[PDB]
Protein: PHOSPHATIDYLINOSITOL-3-PHOSPHATE binding fyve domain OF protein VPS27
Organism: Saccharomyces cerevisiae
Amino acid sequence: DWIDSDACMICSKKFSLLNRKHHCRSCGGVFCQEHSSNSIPLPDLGIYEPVRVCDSCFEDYEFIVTD
Ligand SMILES: [Zn+2]
Ligand SMILES: [Zn+2]
């Protein structure tokens, strides 16, 4: 499920203490803060409080909510 890498999957900037690593709880990828600034619940995983997701997973969720 979760993978790891040394850089953001969207912008390829390398993580460091000044640009920390974060995982998307929906897709398992790694992203910088700028590309994972939103959080959403993941009911299909039994998670009902907002957890961090990447922009792509956030859009997917938002599309379902306002469909
Ligand atoms: Zn990034
Ligand atoms: Zn994601």
